[PDB]
Amino acid sequence: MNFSGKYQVQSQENFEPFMKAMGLPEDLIQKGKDIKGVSEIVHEGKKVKLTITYGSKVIHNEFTLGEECELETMTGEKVKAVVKMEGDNKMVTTFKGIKSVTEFNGDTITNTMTLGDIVYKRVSKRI
Ligand SMILES: CCCCCCCC/C=C\CCCCCCCC(=O)O
Ligand SMILES: CCCCCCCC/C=C\CCCCCCCC(=O)O
């Protein structure tokens, strides 16, 4: 399907509770709470190059679909995980008890991460 492009967050639910349970330090939660971050994807085959920019904070991640790689979380911690291609438009992965589902529909990306009873929801559109 090719997911290349630049997108910006339009809306989100449960950012604070989810981020809290992730151990993201208070002040950052307060700061990123109101930042409409930009995400850039470069998709080439099973190679996904991902860059997330939140104001002055940037995180670079790169992984191969199906392969176990090391993902950098927003705290700085690094984890190992396999990102899978579920269906034709969904990228699914699991780490630290979190279940992550990214669904692509043209200009719209919908991301859903569930931790316990919390469901952090993000809706982005291509810019
Ligand atoms: C697509 C998977 C979901 C990615 C969620 C990313 C969430 C990032 C969380 C917030 C980071 C907080 C950074 C606060 C601002 C730091 C620098 C600044 O002030 O500009
Ligand atoms: C807890 C947040 C830590 C974020 C680390 C990155 C994890 C990303 C894992 C899944 C890859 C799916 C890529 C989807 C990009 C969506 C961009 C967006 O929603 O802004």
UniProtKB/Swiss-Prot annotation:
GO terms for biological process: cellular detoxification; cellular response to hydrogen peroxide; cellular response to hypoxia; fatty acid transport; intestinal absorption; long-chain fatty acid transport; positive regulation of fatty acid beta-oxidation; response to vitamin B3. It is found in: Cytoplasm. The modification Phosphothreonine is found at residue 51. The modification N6-succinyllysine is found at residues 31, 36, 46, 57, 78, 84, 90, 121. The modification N6-acetyllysine is found at residue 84. (9Z)-octadecenoate 2 binds at residues 39, 122. Pfam families: Lipocalin_7 (PF14651). SUPFAM superfamilies: Lipocalins. Gene3D superfamilies: 2.40.128.20. One of its GO terms (cellular component) is nucleus. GO terms for molecular function: antioxidant activity; bile acid binding; chromatin binding; fatty acid binding; heterocyclic compound binding; long-chain fatty acid transmembrane transporter activity; lysophospholipid:sodium symporter activity; oleic acid binding. The modification N-acetylmethionine is found at residue 1. There is a cross-link at residues 105-106 (Isoaspartyl glycine isopeptide (Asn-Gly)). There are three fractions of Z-protein: DE-I, DE-II and DE-III. DE-I is virtually lipid free, DE-II binds palmitic, stearic, oleic, linoleic and arachidonic acids and DE-III binds mainly arachidonic acid. Forms a beta-barrel structure that accommodates hydrophobic ligands in its interior. Belongs to the calycin superfamily. Fatty-acid binding protein (FABP) family. This is Fatty acid-binding protein, liver. The lineage of its organism: Eukaryota, Metazoa, Chordata, Craniata, Vertebrata.
